[PDB]
């Protein structure tokens, strides 16, 4: 808002590095990029309580400079490997209660803290992905009694540590932190890389983000965060919100897949996992042009309390899987209370499966899943309009759908029961 990088020796528009200048202004105050074009040699390390707005940021780093080399911001910098060695204290906690007991804590009122379960899986980073994760602010302390600004929503045994734990480093030996109460407004990003890679946010707002990147909404530990009016041409992954993202809302989002710069290796549509809670996507388009093929457009694995609403999907390929809820069991928190509502799906090909529900294991948990107002425009699916698969002992139960498919399609069930699926033809 108030200060310019120019005031800290920053030069725009000539392809010289300004990262230090931007970071210097961020330390002093809010930052207005003057509607000019800034060039950075590495991600801007963000500052809690700051607004950055009104300009374009391009990376100077060469494609394949290494992970996060091309990134625009480190809005926080959590990655499971750097969170893993942080010492974490045992605490008592009760499902529904904002009160914990922690022997020999050093939390003060106002401190952001991270609550996590000791239950979890070893994930892609070869480290614990807790069954449950929560950032919350301390609002009271008396001896071992700590009060939080939000309840604990699990019966799981938790441990706690300072969200920003002094002495502990992350990538490029920068301190491990969560970005608090920061705002990003009217920014154009221009990178080959994740415009954010490592990240962790709490009460942050991204408003008016446009341009080109590997990704549209991608990062770790997005908490009490809003993403609004995001319109990005992406080359690999529409959205992942990993490592315990919760109470985070995406609205007015245009995921435009990049035909020229498409990277087909490990392509991801919207893929939500790593114990997310109360994450919503509302009013969005996923546009996959000719020449680009995403195998799975929207999938939820390891997310709960999810709402995906007011969606348009257009793909220019065949045999895509459109909407998917999956659970691989073990110590993955259940895929519970998932609403897909008012999704129009166009395919120039013929979808494989439009609605999929898949329990891989005897201990897989999928409950209170609804697919309401799903319109599929395209040829009769090659596998199924709608497929449910459980196991003999672990059936898919209670699933609900309203589907509008002018070319109909197969209704495949395999160890599933107690569904309620209305099919409507065109013309009301």
Author numbering: 27 to 454
Copied sentences from the primary study:
In this study, we elucidated the structural and functional features of the capsular depolymerase KP34gp57 from the Klebsiella phage KP34. In this work, we focused on the structure and function of the CPS depolymerase KP34gp57 derived from Klebsiella phage KP34, which efficiently causes a visible halo zone on bacterial lawns of the K63 serotype of K. pneumoniae.
Therefore, it appeared obvious that KP34gp57 had encountered some proteolytic degradation prior to crystallization. The N-terminal region of each copy (residues 27–56) contains two α-helices, followed by the typical β-helix structure characterizing the catalytic domain of tailspikes (residues 57–102 and 204–454). In addition, a six-stranded β-barrel domain protrudes from the catalytic β-helix between residues 103–203. This crystal structure content was fully unexpected since monomeric tailspikes have hitherto never been observed and their trimeric state is believed to be crucial for enzyme stability. A clear electron density describes the catalytic pocket, thus allowing for the identification of E266 and E300 (belonging to the β-helix structure) as the most promising catalytic residues and D151 (belonging to the insertion domain) as likely assisting CPS binding. This assay confirmed the crucial role of E266 and E300 in catalysis since E266Q/E300Q is fully inactive. In KP34gp57, the high resistance of this CBM to proteolysis, together with the observation of the monomeric state of KP34gp57 once deprived of the CBM, suggests that the CBM domain plays a crucial role in inducing a compact trimerization of the enzyme while still allowing for the necessary flexibility needed by the catalytic domain for enzymatic catalysis.
